Write a protein that binds this DNA or RNA. Structure first.
Lengths: 68, 124, 155, 252
RNA sequence: AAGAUCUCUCAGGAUCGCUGGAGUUGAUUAAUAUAAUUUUACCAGGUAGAGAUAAUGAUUAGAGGACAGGGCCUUGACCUAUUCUCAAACUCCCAAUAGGUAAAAAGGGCGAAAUAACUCAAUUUGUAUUUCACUCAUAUUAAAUAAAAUAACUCCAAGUGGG
RNA sequence: AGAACAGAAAUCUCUUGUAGACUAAAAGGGGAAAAGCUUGUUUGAUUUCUAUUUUCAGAACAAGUAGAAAACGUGAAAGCGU
RNA sequence: GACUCGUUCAUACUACAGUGGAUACACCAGAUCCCAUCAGAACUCUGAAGUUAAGCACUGUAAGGCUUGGCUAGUACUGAGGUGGGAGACCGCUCGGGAACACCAGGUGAUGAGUCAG
């Protein structure tokens, strides 16, 4: 987990890691298809409308429920 | 209104409210001086006490007795102006809590809290 | 082998979820006795006249009843033969079976159909349906109510 | 930990509604109900006695598959119709209430004689039963006096003598069902203090009934008894929540 | 047949199973008994599965909080919302498959009368039984399908018990 | 959260407390107006006999279940106790 | 309107609030007698002075839980078949059956018998 600027480096590191894992493995680059709302379009939209509040590392979605 | 505090179950003696071990020692010296002494309590060495009803007992005990809010929601006032002695608190509608037929319990609204007890202490 | 009585405790004898001490009034009172079929089900509450493991969920006829005991004729396969065994169980364990209730409702409904037919002097069959093969039918379909399907690309 | 939480709530069971109230223990209920399966159809009548702070309530109940069927009823404020205007929890009142409920039940059945098979010289003769009814079965407890009244009435119930004074004293029991024990306390209290007497037995004074009069009034009553047969929908709630949100924006 | 049970028992024996003979029963009426089956009712389950924010045992991280360790701060524990991975010897929930009971004439209906030493105030209160009735589909059928009696049942004995 | 003694060798009080206790041992089941804990009164841990269930050849023994004929025990109130 | 006996045993639970007390419930008042405890706290007994302050009745709350439905998903999973594929691990296919959590939406009781007052 890092910047997209270093995504190739991260992918390469996992490719280095694969030689020390038994049999076939696949590095998967996309975090848009990684969910946990880690889509860029989701990050901007959720942040903009204050939907998602960070409790560290990952970010928690409000759901219109209980007292304030 | 009818919500105010009431009281049962306290015990007394004829000395100065010495507390603890010392009260028992003083009582033994007093027992050696003169053979008269009051009655047994209920507990798990030994000493003797006067059984008196409720409110009247508390009034004598308070006069004997003589962080500002040393008090706690228990109804325990400690010693002020330790021992195995009785002390107690009850709210007005308390009976529902132990009463058999329709059970239930005292409400959060009805309960004493710290503050009402603190008003009661200031009142006397 | 090495087989004591209640073996398989964590399996069969384990209680139903939140079901503790269930002993309400209606449980007792059913009364069809000597002709009746009856299911043998374990109760979490009652240990006193609990059956052996095999008889759980099985059904059989009542042949004898006492104060709160029931004798039940249950079928058991013993190797090369199925044989009838006299299972003593308690009132809490016996549950009224529902197979009789299906026969009875069908008898009553058919009897009403027979009675109706008899009043008219009709010739008709009160026998159960087979759920036979579907006959011809019709629907009128505009272009809006019909949807084109196709397989899906990976996504 | 908080302890009281979603997991604790999910696990929880409170069981029977009456058990939540503090009525109907089920342990008694099953035993009262229970009978031999070959003695089917026959009913074990319970003589139901429940102790209110205002009055004692006496019913004849038989338990059935859609709930209990009530055959007979007497409550102490029926005693007004028999001229008794005060002392509604009293030992004599409980006796009379049971006696009336039994006598009315026999009248409803027909035939004042309880049993066919009686001995020739000195339902069934005694087949109806106690309802324990939550109150504690000590000596002088209310249920036994009501049952004794019902027995003397006509219905009859199995009994010991273990909950009458002298556990027995039949004369003292006789005084208690007459009302003498109240009368003795009234006269004694009046003797000690007139204001405490007046403030205590205030209704008796208004009625103009002295201690003396109680035994006669119960005796006359016995003969007379013997003779005589909002919620709000979701759409509104949603609207309220929106309005409250706006209100909070204005308020702060 | 190389299963089982008991055996100073594991190269055996006995008794069950599975085999043959012999007899009887009833079958011939395309049906009833009957069926390694499905139908429609009706059940029994806690394995596959799934879960950790349901409990148990685990178990990786930070975030938000009001006492403890270190030098007003930091580090912790502790609480709270969270968070990562878990068990077939854990279970909120939870299959398919496999398994059980059911489908009326020696019986069932609704009635009367009988019988009792049971029951119940209640020798017709119920019960059960019995005798009389009235009557339930069935020309084919009380859901299918069936070289379904080649079925039953009794006897006597064999081989087998290492797979 | 309070009380000089158990905070920290087996204590005292109030409040919160679905069982996280306890149920001789042995592990799992079951069990909260109780099968836990306290107390009272007790000896049925009885005599006789079945139908049976477990293991099973559907023999034994052993362990059970449901009753019955007795005499009692307890509550005395239903009941429950082999 | 209230109560008693109940039934189903959370739609019936819990939490925090508010509204209601003709008759009723309860809180409340007392201890001679019946009774019971160190203790009239509870329990028993006898009262009926006050009061809705609680219990109790009813509702409310971007309440928690429970509770139905959708949706998760024909996914996961799975019986029989295959001289099907795959080096192996495993994966398709034919005939069939088929979840769960999460999530979303709704809901927060119904009812037998008897009584009493209006």
């Amino acid at each position: 987990r890092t910047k997209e600027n270093f995504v190739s480096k991260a992918c390469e590191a996992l490719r280095r890691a694969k030689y020390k894992f038994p049999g076939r493995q696949k590095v998967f680059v996309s975090n848009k298809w990684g969910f946990t709302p880690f889509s860029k379009d989701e990050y901007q939209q959720y942040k903009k409308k204050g939907r998602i509040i960070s409790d560290g590392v990952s970010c928690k979605f409000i759901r219109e429920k209980g007292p304030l | 209104v009818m919500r105010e505090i009431k009281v049962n179950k306290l015990v007394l003696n004829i000395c100065v409210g010495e507390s603890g071990d010392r009260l028992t020692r003083a009582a033994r010296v007093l027992e050696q001086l003169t053979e008269q002494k009051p009655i047994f309590g209920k507990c798990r060495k030994i000493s003797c006490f006067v059984t008196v009803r409720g409110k009247k007992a508390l009034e004598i005990l308070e006069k004997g007795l003589k962080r500002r809010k040393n008090f706690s929601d228990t109804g325990n006032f400690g010693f002020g102006i330790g021992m195995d002695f009785y002390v107690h608190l009850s709210r007005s509608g308390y009976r529902v809590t132990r009463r058999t037929r329709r059970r239930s319990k005292i409400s959060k609204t009805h309960k004493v809290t710290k503050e009402d007890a603190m008003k009661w202490f200031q009142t006397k | 082998k090495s087989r004591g009585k209640r073996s398989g405790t964590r399996y069969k004898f384990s209680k139903k979820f939140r079901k503790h001490g269930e002993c309400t009034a209606n449980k007792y009172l059913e009364k069809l006795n000597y002709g009746d079929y009856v299911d043998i089900v374990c109760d979490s509450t009652q240990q006193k006249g609990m059956p052996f493991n095999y008889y759980h969920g099985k059904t059989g006829k009542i042949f004898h009843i006492t104060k709160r005991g029931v004798g039940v004729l249950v079928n058991k396969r013993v190797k090369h033969r199925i044989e009838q065994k006299k299972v003593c169980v308690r009132i809490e364990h016996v549950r009224k079976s529902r197979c009789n209730e299906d026969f009875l409702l069908r008898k009553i409904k058919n009897a009403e159909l027979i009675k109706e037919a008899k009043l008219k002097n009709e010739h008709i069959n009160i026998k159960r349906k087979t759920e036979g093969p579907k006959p011809a039918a019709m629907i009128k379909v505009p272009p809006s109510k019909i949807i084109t399907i196709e397989p899906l690309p990976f996504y | 930990k908080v302890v009281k939480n979603k997991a604790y709530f999910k696990r929880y069971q409170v069981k029977y509604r009456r058990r939540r109230e503090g009525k109907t223990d089920y342990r008694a209920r099953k035993a009262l109900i229970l009978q031999d399966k070959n003695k089917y159809n026959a009913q074990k009548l319970r003589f139901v006695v429940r102790k209110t702070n205002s009055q004692v309530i006496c019913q004849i109940a038989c338990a059935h598959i859609e709930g209990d069927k009530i055959l007979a009823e007497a409550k102490s404020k029926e005693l007004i119709r028999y001229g008794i205007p005060v002392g509604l929890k009293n030992y004599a009142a409980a006796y009379a209430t049971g006696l009336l409920c039994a006598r009315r039940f026999l009248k409803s059945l027909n035939l004042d004689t309880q049993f066919l098979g009686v001995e020739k010289v000195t339902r069934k003769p005694i087949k109806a039963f106690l309802d324990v009814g939550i109150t504690r079965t000590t000596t002088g407890n209310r249920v036994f006096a009501a049952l004794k009244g019902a027995c003397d009435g006509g219905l009859n119930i199995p009994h010991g003598n273990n909950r009458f004074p002298g556990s027995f004293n039949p004369e003292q029991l006789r005084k208690n069902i007459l009302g003498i024990h109240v009368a003795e306390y009234m006269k004694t209290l009046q003797e000690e203090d007139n204001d405490k007497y007046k403030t205590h037995f205030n209704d008796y004074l208004k009625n103009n009934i002295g201690a003396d009069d109680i035994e006669q009034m119960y005796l006359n009553a016995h003969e007379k008894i013997r003779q005589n047969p909002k919620k709000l929908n979701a759409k509104l709630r949603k609207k309220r929540v929106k309005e409250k949100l706006a209100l909070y924006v204005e308020l702060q």
